[model samples]
Target: GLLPKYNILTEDQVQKIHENTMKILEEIGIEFEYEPALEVFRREGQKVEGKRVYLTREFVESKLKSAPAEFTLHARNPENNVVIGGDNIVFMPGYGAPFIYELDGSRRKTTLQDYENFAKLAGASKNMHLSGGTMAEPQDIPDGVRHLQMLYSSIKNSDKCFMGSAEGKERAEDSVEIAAILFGGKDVIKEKPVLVSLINSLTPLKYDERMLGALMAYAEAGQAVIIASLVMAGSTGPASLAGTLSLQNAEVLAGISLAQSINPGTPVIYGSTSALSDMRSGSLSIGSPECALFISASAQLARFYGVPSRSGGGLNDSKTVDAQAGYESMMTLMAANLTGVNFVLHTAGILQYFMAMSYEKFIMDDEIAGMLLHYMKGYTFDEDGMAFDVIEKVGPGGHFLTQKHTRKNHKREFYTPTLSDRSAYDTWAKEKLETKQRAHARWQQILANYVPPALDPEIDAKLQAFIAQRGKEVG
Candidate 1:
């Protein structure tokens, strides 16, 4: 009853997923690279087949026993408290792409300058909780030093949540170290603000050794890991939605079990980045019907686990930001939000199956996020909400906007737009600006006016020094 809106699991489908997850845990099992994690799982009586760590349902449940139901991902600004692993979903823009399309009718591969500007924009965005990966590849930095440069830029420019590529074990370890240093925890406190990493499984139930190694490192450190399984239905996976969903389920759960077995209470989020294949183009379609389905199913699985979830995004096949972008993004985003996703990345500014991000797109998507947050709040059943007396007072001809009730509740009930370009005809004509123009203007405004919380000078210096030192060490 709580799930039909998402068009997610049937009663039978839900049961099947649980059964399959159990089978994967006890039969297929995941390969573990960390010997200590393997030993621990083995000692706990898991069905180990060589390096594969097969766990029973009871084993999986027991492993989750110590995981915190919720934790705060502290933002650089104290006011930006992002609650993780809860009913509330936090959405953010895409991370790590190589190209950007500009408002000046220019398209080019990203540079360090582009990365800095994106970071500044992210620092200014109110709705995008996490400043996602560098949306552009900055070739200005030498290949060897790019990651280090970008990492520092992300930390310095925004106090919001950020993401980095957890490509392999070394990067995963580097990510944790960065988080620990930022969160002011022990160099080893991978459990808190400095969360670990995310790894996506190749379709049809396979994961590479490198990603598995990332899983092990993060899990061993008691850090958060996202088991993102991406399947393109009708292409790399089964043609049927249900069949594809089943495979996606198995892959994500396998990754989850691997993390749980690594450290019984290691925080893990079940996720999927599934999409559909365009029949004509043979390219992945982010705006497809199946993509929406994936969002719903991922949410359902996350609910079953009672753990945090990360899924769905404001994605579209459109070449530019427009009505198509609005509808497509909202459809998927609304599903993810309503279904109780806890840590939603790629929540904004993506188009053409993640080939490009638009300034206008980011602005529009943030407004969309704010709107949904209000929508999902649902109508309150309180006396004030009922407002029978107020309704009677504001007769058919009267305006409710002027009523005291309006003044008291309107601010709370409505999400006002900053970049939404909402205006009367005359006002619009005077400005004559499109969403892209408005977004570009807003980006400049925020950078000129927005200020982050002041950091402790000593800590700031230490972090900078640590980043530099890590650069040297890694280099």
Candidate 2:
């Protein structure tokens, strides 16, 4: 399959980056919160000072060698099955976007109902391979049971993909329980994962107890864990762009090595969320060119390690959806796809970096992703697609639209959008709809007509009760 242009990485440069990353890991340790993880590093002959754990370059290299560059994320619903980083680029939804638009009809922040609805919508979407997972903090569910609420939402909404959190170990276990309920045995789950979890590293090498515990829980269960290192380029790490990427590499490699040492061949998706901080506000600017470079360079780094990489987001720091949102998001997402990164987490509709998820923007981004994927598809290889015969037949004066082949190919050629306004000028004028206005209308239409994948009612009730009970216990 064709990919977007601009993945202009030299093999020599990639290898150099990989070496520097290991040097960082050896020289400057990433802070580890859990003692057990520290002990694992110690047993593996890594250098440890307090909670800061450093790995030898050899250890980092060995672990990277063990991790496979590609893996299959089997969608339980079957229709959503996708291969990450192999040939065809799989498009998934944006992770960790808050669902409520306060300016819009949503009275408050994202709620459990909002999460469930979005998960259902994602399950139904043709392009979305995996539900983005953490759409928002479901405030209605209460802080105590938020993770459980998300887990239940995944089980109840779709059997196809996965949902996860960076919260902590308890949440990871909650996700595991839901996976167990979906796929028969924990043993089977170990062999073929039904769910995955997200765990992130602190900038300049730091990880808290909660994330460590969660990583351990998922590793023990034989489920995949996405260990990402989010480096703020200018401030958090080095001021130089390449230096920041190398730092990110070391942080994630440390985490991945620990997971593998704990359980041999434990599925780990290596990741980077490194973005340059705005010099004025010190905020991570998701929309900047620096962010795009971070993603593209990070893709090369992760691939060097031969592990599935997770990064680029359909992200913008915009408080409201506008031109900034569209341009910023498209640029960053295009970076990830072009570099052949595996397992993209955020592929649609996020604004303000985990702050909010616009229903309108979600529709807009879905179309954007479709367009990019179509662009990347560049040329066709089919014998008939080379179509010299058709060209010869339609020479000069021939009207191709009236031809039989044209009718057959038209349906195959187009990706019809649910909300994208492609109507004729007169029709659009009559409706008085811009793309955004039409997208807003269609979001409602989708919700109204959408049929969520039905879960066995008995299992659904059990999952709900499980979450409710856990919520009380956690509280």
Candidate 3:
């Protein structure tokens, strides 16, 4: 489903990258911290030495063949079903932020209520296709049971497809159980994926226990998993962009292989969160052009492998929703869209290199998503669209205001922004409102009128019972 107009890597370069990735997997190998995963590799004819598993090219390639290039993620509301892969792109909100930047310039640890509010914001968004898991970490909630609450909030607040927990095997299973209750049973959900989860690899060719555990759980249940890497170039990875790409490629391939090994034909996405390191601070430069390049290259690589890909969103490194954030977010998001990324996580409300979420930024990013969706549609060239008769009627010096064609095509042809200030200079001055201020007010207005989609009462009751029971057991 990609329109491959942007070329970040030459055909030869892509091949070289693939060769290097395979070399890394074959020689250096990868560490599988979970014994179950290690056993799967060992049984599958891989050379296992403790945590390190050396995979042959044939083993990796054969396992990869079982993964489907595309799959559907069924939502509670059937109309909200998402087709993952192909040209179909799905947008999800930011995930795993522990702090909230309030509109009044105050920052604080996120609470359960704040998590629910972000869900509402995502549900209210016209462009975000998934409510997303862990939009903000509810620090006030106990870690042992927070995943339960967060999953409940996502299901209750949005009718769209949502992410499941990937913290560990238990939490991943809990997510499946909740989805089972909503979908009637585990068997039904497994047949049709009701949950997708993110499993990140520890940079430099390692899969930790927690991530491996979640990967196994989700894969066994036939759910989709995004095997992503958060490689910060020059720190977690080699400083060169190509080197980092190769490293990220190897890590994702290994994880995908593990998922397929767990369950044949389990859905998987080729994902990347690789970014350049700010040399000055040795921190992730998510807002940099190199980050966008990584996303672009990742999409091409996924295409080469014939799988759905995930990367980039409303990404920025700014602490506040300022010009820097605006431009940086647009740069990365546009690259993702143009490069044919199938699933974009962290689509909105991200700030400070993925540590914080902001309401104002969320609202602003919604407008950006709307505009990009319109851009993606490109142009129509049908008889009516040609408008030969309308053009003849208008001619030179003719005002389009009174033309019927203008009335008929204006809405479809133009992107009407909610937060952009397009008024006359004098009018804008008179209002004395900045983009951030308007965005702040808009988010508040949206929240005030937001109504969460209604969940089946029986299903809701069952979910509540499950969460309560699990909470008590863990406590």
Candidate 4:
């Protein structure tokens, strides 16, 4: 279910912004630095000049029509399966974090152990639907085989849905390959949509070779993709917000159109990671209200194009999981939900823009994600909900806490907090544990005794064998 969507712009403004985006698509055009992608346009009889493809309105619109307005993404456990469009929201853990935060306030390169730990965190989470592609890249693992390792980590520690790697053509292929091993077969996964991945555009209207290769590989395999952009308003794009949005829209559409051209009805999200940069420092200000504005506007644009939308989660530029992190996170997370973003990556455990993940921050963000979902789910109103009889019986100077109605409805009516302190000051003071401290304890204990959902031993053995074979060939 969705809250009433936040339409940040008038219908005319959306149309005007869309016209600019189409202008960029036709005139400036997005550049794909890959011959294969260029040839896809050429094969379809669309315009191709050098590496730039002038995506005609007719062709882009035709392709967008095939992009599913709503699609189901299957998980190993059917209960974990989710639909990417419609009145639903699917959260994923923070992706591509290179560094991780320890409780002692130290940041260091992430290893396979850290990756597995984060997968466990995602597995245990009710809010996180996909276990995530890379919460923090494993620095210790070899680059070529890293994707396989991460996939294995998530599959072993996370039985729910999992994001696939999309670093290059080979990694993308391996992602499909191993997911096939986990699921029954390639055919089963292809038709059922087992894996979803992200592919970024080289901003200011470009798709780099690596990302293009990944896009094609995933599209051909019929896996879901969030063709995203992370354009910095003042740097990678124009200084103006509207101008930046136009650029973002064109880039995402370029990727989506390409996917549709490859395989009609392949799942694709109109992804947006665009944000403003603080001009003084010339760095991304992911925590800024300007960031939320970008997210809100892009959600509407995706709706206009009739595709599922992707936005950030618990986003912040703060170097640590402090007060700044929590506030900025809520601001961005709140905007995504209000604006009806279907797929939210980096929904938890993100810190310092997109550079790091904190174990404490992961738990804290999960709490916030759950809280926001409850907020969006407006309360029911019917005869039983009215409870006139119960209220009349406990009319004045009477505690309803002891009543049957309270017992029956309190759990459903009230939102529970996992990390929040709701006790009286004296009771709270006895613990002396703030949110971060509580988060730290929560993750530490969970990680120590965490038991992942069971994966069949035969399937587990098959997956390892595939990974081993891949390592020998790639590494």
Candidate 5:
């Protein structure tokens, strides 16, 4: 069950980074624009001056103790339930991208249809553990009601654990209520992890009203909250990797501490979307090795704090599904798994620094995730695995292809590719298809054959009613 891991910092470096984070929290302080969050801090005996709340190491560490190191995410279908901590890593689709790149070389703003389709694809993928929240920021839907629609789509299309809306207080509450409908009641949901929401800090050290509102709402309800940061080194943060990590640690710890303060046993994931900036272009370079270091280091920091960590994904800066996209996505996604990240977001369909989603890339990334998960499984070494008897039976250069043991074990031993062509050169040339072209055909075939897991009629009716009522209210 053990595999190799990547460690960028020694024990001394981890401690130094932790000390610096506490120094930032205690001396520099973090801004809580929402009064409710400020009040939570003040009531807990923390130093508060207007919007700035200075947290001590004692307060931060004590609160963090209440967050579980691992928890189960309950899915609509029990079989799809996921363990999100320790050695387990859950992969999900890219979130919050505003546009879609079509297979026909056209890009456009995402719509509700595209959102539902992505959810279906996630549901269909063996490697994607969570269907995710806001797979694409569907521009066609109204902002006020979009969250509700997207959540509805995800739930209806996938039986897996999915993310809830974290737009604001009302939307977050709505998400909880909707989950309540699906899972029986609020009490039942609180007893088990039903929905996880993302709460991102406004980088440097600020928590805006909307994000804080959602954070407190989900925290109070006893649901899991991913307290994450999007620190851009050389831009929003200091140029140094260590400096960016310190800033990221401070921001995420601040949010995690607040969640625990709100509810002592709240499930929280320490999350980071920290990346480097391309100095020449002044754009985020998530594909760079520097960004991979941020992800690997962030996982180590999460372990140091004793909580589940989330980072890395099928991340890339490529505008299309090219060779660069393949290499970059493989590097980032593999780094995340090897470094023992507990949860991963934006695992597929991300392009152009989170600006767009590509249908072809989504399919390709599914294969990438499958191969990586296989790679992480390592190998078995039992008596059967040794195969000494089988080797002896096939001695003297005899081919094993016709052996009964080979027939039984080859499927388990070899990884079959879905889109990758392993055919002879002449055969591949006869088809005259590139990987991207094959990926397009494969995605279309998947969508055509996809049959969503059946939802209970009673639950479906109740969910639709709730959405309809909320749609009118918000619209």
Candidate 6:
């Protein structure tokens, strides 16, 4: 576990946020559009008024306590598996991008091939932990069958931990069944979860039937769930950051309670993808300083609740991967890691406020993600690390450039810049390749040389038949 040293919110501040969160759940209440969710609350002896279920601190306290503090996400290759809690931080490519930004920075509808390509890129990434779901929505495929294609593409291209579909009960079930096939059987998966699903709230304190159904199905299946709230402060939620955090916390806690009730010890993550609303055009300003603050505060609240935390993307609203994109990505990701966010969704391959994913951006984000991982490696602090002997020998006049210690420790201590050029102007000017151009070439090179990790042919046959039958039934 990489220990965290940043705590933006002190204990007293977290207590106040918790206090306001309790009030929001108890007094204001959350609307559950699904009857089964309301039924769960009703059966639990909690207050219910029509679709509005008023949750108390005590009910949530009991249910939330049953969730695991840490749980492993078993990957297809055991070597690629990751833990979702503790100080372990997991990175993955951007999700749910409907449009793909080409090398020319032009937007087009994402194809199934684009989805496969991102999965391959994710497989090739040294820093990414999971081949995230819904990397891009394929316009050609039918909505009912898109999840099937996505899961197959994700599984075929990468052996890492994969995310599951989030919209409906059937799609979520399909995800579970497919994962069960790949990772042995349903019984095996129940004991060691291989899938993680995202369940978003219908902002302003509500859960629609679709998200509710998916939540219940995944919980019952013993898969991990990230109960996230992307409250656009000033629009869907309160204007104040504190007010929005309280709302975010209450909604996440409410979802956690539902999951724990369905099955005790469910591996649930406290997800907060909230950001400030741009009053100028009514769009989300995810690149704002407020977004970083929200990431820090939400992670703090998750620690307070003793659950893994999730932050929004290394987020930006830039239409392209230019200066705005890199700084914004750095700011958001740095904040998330510093505050100990356990899972980072949309950490790479995104542009234009989740509307687009760029191939260049994917490579660029992977580079920064590597740099961030280097930052999280902490430091060595022994006698050799102190290097007093080398310092004493070098003294004031001479440099340590030719010393034995320099050669011995330099590679291990220094972070090599893969994307960033540190060359002199005389050398740089001869070729003069811009970062985006280099980024564009890197992805093309990666995909051209990419090879799918092997899967058992028998297991592959079952997954194929499952898809064929489901498509015939649904299509």
Model 4 error, position 173 (Å)? 0.6
lDDT tens digits by residue: candidate 6, 7-58: 8998999999999999999998999999889999999999999999999999
lDDT of 1 by residue, 87-138 (tens): 6677777766676767764666778877777777777876777777756678
lDDT tens digits by residue: candidate 5, 247-295:
9999999999999999988899999999988999899999999889999
Poorest stretch of ten by lDDT in candidate 5: 1-10
Per-residue lDDT of candidate 4, residues 1-475 (tens digit):
3358778899999989988888989998778999999999999998888998899888988999999999898888899989997768899899999998776778899899989999998888788888887877989888888888888899889878888888999889889988898878889988899888999999988899999889999999979999999889989999998999989989999999999999999999999999987889879888988889999998888888999999969999987777998999999999999989899999998888888989999998999999999988876787658889998999888878899888888897678898888889999888788888899889988888889989999998999888878779874
Full-model lDDT for every candidate = 0.72, 0.75, 0.90, 0.89, 0.90, 0.90
Q: What CA root-mean-square deviation does each model show from the true structure?
A: 3.4, 2.3, 1.3, 1.3, 1.3, 1.2
User: How well does model 1 score by local distance difference test?
Assistant: 0.72
Which is the better candidate, 1 or 3, if ranked by lDDT? Answer: 3
Please give the TM-score that candidate 2 achieves against the real structure.
Answer: 0.93
TM per candidate comes to 0.88, 0.93, 0.98, 0.97, 0.98, 0.98
Residue pairs in candidate 4 whose N, alpha carbon or C atoms collide under 3 angstroms: none
lDDT score, candidate 2: 0.75
Candidate 6 colliding pairs, count: 0
Give one clash count per candidate, in the order shown: 3, 5, 2, 0, 0, 0
